[PDB]
């Protein structure tokens, strides 16, 4: 999906880890990493294994694709994407030498769609909607940008009352992320912007 690719690109631009995982709707998980292209290296030279809780360890079929380098990734079976439980991940070379090792909580690696329907009007009041098709909107926190000036919004709040200059065109944009403490993750893309000539 162009959505996974764009969200993966967003995460890959930030890291900080090499082995990156993100969920979109807390019922899914994709983990990926990037390395230099080696002529003899395909998914066969790596094993992706994981254990949830004390269940039998499982293997995940590795996929691969070029990038601007080579990206390996695995898409977890939905049955194994439960929240609030240790998901222990391992990537192991064919020799048995460990490559990556990470425990993650799915609820802590949320990457949402961007907010939609941004609108501004003169009272400058800024309003928007949460990412579409996203549960627990009451736990989504936001940040608006003015144009350079960043304003933080409390979770569940979808309005920002904004000092400015007269006869001025202001471009606004919003992005969203799951709010601590029960959830965490990464900033979405910025929303579609809007302009107001003050």
């Amino acid at each position: 999906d162009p959505k996974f690719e764009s969200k993966a690109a967003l995460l890959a631009a930030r890291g900080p880890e090499e082995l990156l995982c993100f969920t979109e709707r807390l019922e899914d998980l994709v983990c990926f990493w990037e390395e230099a292209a080696s002529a003899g290296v395909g998914p066969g030279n790596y094993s992706f294994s994981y254990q949830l809780e004390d269940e039998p360890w499982k293997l995940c079929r590795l996929h691969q694709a070029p990038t601007a380098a080579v990206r390996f990734w695995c898409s977890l079976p939905t049955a194994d994407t439960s929240s609030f439980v240790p998901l222990e991940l391992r990537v192991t070379a064919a020799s048995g030498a460990p490559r990556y090792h990470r425990v993650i909580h799915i609820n802590e690696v949320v990457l949402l769609d961007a907010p939609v329907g941004l609108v501004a009007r003169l009272a400058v009041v800024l309003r928007w909607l949460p990412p579409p098709e996203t549960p627990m909107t009451s736990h989504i926190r936001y940040e608006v940008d003015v144009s350079v000036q960043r304003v933080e919004i409390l979770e569940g709040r979808t309005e920002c009352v904004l000092n400015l200059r007269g006869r001025t065109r202001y471009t606004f944009a919003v992005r969203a992320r799951m709010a601590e403490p029960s959830f965490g993750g990464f900033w979405s893309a910025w929303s579609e912007p809007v302009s107001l000539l003050t």
Partner: antibody
Amino acid sequence: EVQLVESGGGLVQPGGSLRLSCAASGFNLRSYYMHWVRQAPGKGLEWVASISPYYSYTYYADSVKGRFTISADTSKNTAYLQMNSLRAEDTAVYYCARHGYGAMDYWGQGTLVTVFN
Amino acid sequence: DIQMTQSPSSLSASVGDRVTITCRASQSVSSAVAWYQQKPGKAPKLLIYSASSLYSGVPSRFSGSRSGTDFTLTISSLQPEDFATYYCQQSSYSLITFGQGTKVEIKR
């Protein structure tokens, strides 16, 4: 339901050999990391070896590398520790343990290896 | 080679006391730290995993915490069955290592 039952410990000289067994019930041993951990008399816990699920990758403490071998037999649902080139530091109670919750959830009762010349 | 330095090596306390045991990693182990209880003649018992989650059946007076490479096991109100030796463990690397243990003895 889950049980680990060990055996094989005993008195052994250096230049002798021993094979420890760890028979599992209530779970498929091939589907888990299995660990061996030992405890010298009066001392703490020291990890010894690990074997990985499905591929059977093996990992060893430096002090046992090249002398001990961890392995597993799926048919008998059992893990093993083969011990050669034994030394006085090897005298200990050896536990086997299953990997779960990022740790060792289930443990055997231990079997004693005593080294003597 | 990650070192798990446990403090103190032993302590004495009374029933009802709040007991804190500390384990410091020589390098980052993320949150991959577990705590075990052991009594003479018995195998260790998993108490806490991922630094702060309680294993099933462990009573709620046991808690764990992480700050950086600093890991703490706390027993909020020591009970007679809690006198034992406690071990921390990191399993973030394939070379698993344990703390040296902390014996909790009976004060009198």
